[PDB]
């Protein structure tokens, strides 16, 4: 594979386009466990390579093969799962989620920068998807936000956490419980985006960044090392929200199933 | 007794509504030790009341019925406790300062949804109030600010920790201490107030926030749960802070306690 | 020494000018070892007697006698210490460095008001050492940033724990890392410098801002020791990052030492 892989161990740049299998495949980008579980498995991979190697300062992309970002989580699982009171199992993939972010966040344990383009929507897990990533880079009149509200739950995963980087408590909950939706030119004037370029320019633009990030190699890894000991989320931290966002799907009423099962039928 | 309660149990909504002693009486709508004894006892009342109902996300407001919001501590208690140099009772109204505004921002141990509709001016104790709760209504052209430090005093009630929460730690500083006044919509625009609406409909604005809000209860429960891990401000920090303002207020000179009663004489 | 000291006793105001012998010696207006020797040690004269004198709400005010405020670190000491390769001994100027900037924010443990004059362009450690006071004036026209990183470095003697006092921790690693230079007037509109004026008027608002403190004595020692409970950046924390800015320096490539040669002799 669901991913698209692209190595490039030369420059050590890595580019990991989602929804490979879309290409040939129905539709629904989405983070299905199928693609959360390439990321993450990826990730380990990627992990002791670059580490063994000693590459100083590895680049991390995350980008998608899809005419959006992602969707957010797989709306069928979750009904199937809350329906079969099965908690156990959806705890499992919001950990997995969780633990697939929080690499891009903690540049794989090697100290790399991750960055983000946003070619296409990036609702939900879509947006702390986005989040995660060090760099943000979105294309003029993408739209992001996180619209998970509407069905009485909210975005366990990271999100208050990734949000709480770059605003206040207060505001990262207003964004969360407004359930609002936003364009890229808004999310730069929050700071929610880091850098916004225009149409169909975004492919380059994360060429741009590479190109002077990997002139401060060594000031980049001290930066990732500074932040690990003051303002990085831990990852049992998030483990905690997960468990409470897993026990408030798991009482999640009929009307709400409904209007997922409603998003399911068009998503 | 000094609060006027509109609560109704089959929609979980409850409305306290400061200063009614005073459509009648003089004057001094300020945190009178009688309105803060009554405002945390009623939180006590409606505290295991709605924990043995077992209500999920319910609403509480907490409005003026005078001309202002508030106006702030009892200076004249002050004046009196500090002149007969005693701690011991002006520590008590401190404590019992804080153990109101912190069940406000605890959501009263029910996680409840905050909400302070602010019609009149709030100046000190009451604009910290107002920061307690969770959203923040106020009507157009309303004055709120703190000018505890007239009198060479600092707003210790719990000012310090509800704005750290919506900007910035040095600019927390500076509020305080600068001794100015805003005007609702440029505290709107410092993320200090999240609602601002023509006057007089001010409740209906409110009306606004508790039905949305109580169209996602479980997404509010997670929140406050959230909140409860990290970001929200600890009971025993709010504690030393006041402990520090005894202190300073036992250093007061005859100085200051002149300012206190002009401000006493111009409101 | 190697300053200027505008005493005040009667006034409890203290004025610490670096760069006395820049009239009279060579150039380079940095921080050298005697200068930061210098700065720490008047700190703790000054700072046992103000203690002694029970003294409440000093101030003590950082300026420069040379025409910029201060260029920042000593990159002639570090061509030299990195080649030669004596880690012990450049950690040590960095501990006394942090302990410089650090015995400003926390008031020399005494409460004290300390308040940054920029005079001039106040680049790298100069930026950190302005940050590191609790009031910024600065005059119109005057660049601060941090260039460090354009030679592969990255400001470790107080950047980031000062930066994260006033903005998000992603808005102060992007500034960091960026390696930008702002003028004063945008400065002041990320909340960074508080206090903009014309050219020559230096002392004039720097006088005025003595003026308005100490007409509130009492309140500015609560809210000195409410930021000791938790908002004061720990000495500790900061020695901790300066083992990574050290453990950085020794991994510079004769690329960047020979840029910082290039430096030096343009200054």
């Known amino acids: 594979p669901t991913l698209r892989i692209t190595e490039e161990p030369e420059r050590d740049v890595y580019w990991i386009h989602m929804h490979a299998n879309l290409v040939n495949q129905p539709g629904r980008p989405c983070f299905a466990s199928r693609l959360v579980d390439d990321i993450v498995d990826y990730q380990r991979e990627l992990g002791d390579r670059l580490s063994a190697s000693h ?36 705890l499992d993939y919001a950990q997995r989620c969780v633990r697939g972010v929080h690499a891009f966040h903690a540049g794989l344990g090697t100290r790399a920068h991750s960055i983000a ?23 003029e009149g993408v739209l992001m936000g996180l619209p998970e509200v509407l069905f009485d739950l909210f975005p366990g995963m990271g999100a208050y956490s990734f949000l709480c980087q770059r605003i206040s408590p207060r505001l990262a909950e207003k964004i969360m419980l407004e359930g609002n939706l936003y364009t890229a ?4 004037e929050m700071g929610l ?4 370029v225009p149409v169909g320019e975004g492919v380059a633009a994360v060429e741009q960044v590479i190109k002077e990030s990997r002139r401060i190699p060594h000031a980049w890894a001290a930066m990732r090392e500074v932040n690990e000991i003051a303002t990085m989320v831990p990852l049992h931290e998030m483990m905690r929200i997960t468990e409470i966002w897993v026990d408030t799907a798991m009482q999640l009423g009929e009307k709400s199933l409904r209007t997922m099962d409603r998003l399911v039928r068009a998503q």
């Open 185 to 188: 030119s808004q999310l730069k």
């Open 55 to 90: 590459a100083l300062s590895p680049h991390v992309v995350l980008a998608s093969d899809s005419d959006v970002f992602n969707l957010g989580g797989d709306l069928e699982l979750f009904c199937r799962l809350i329906r079969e009171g099965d908690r156990a199992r959806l």
């Open 117 to 139: 383009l946003v070619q296409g929507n990036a609702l939900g897990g879509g947006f702390e998807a986005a989040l995660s990533c060090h760099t943000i880079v979105a294309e």
């Open 193 to 196: 985006v880091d850098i916004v």
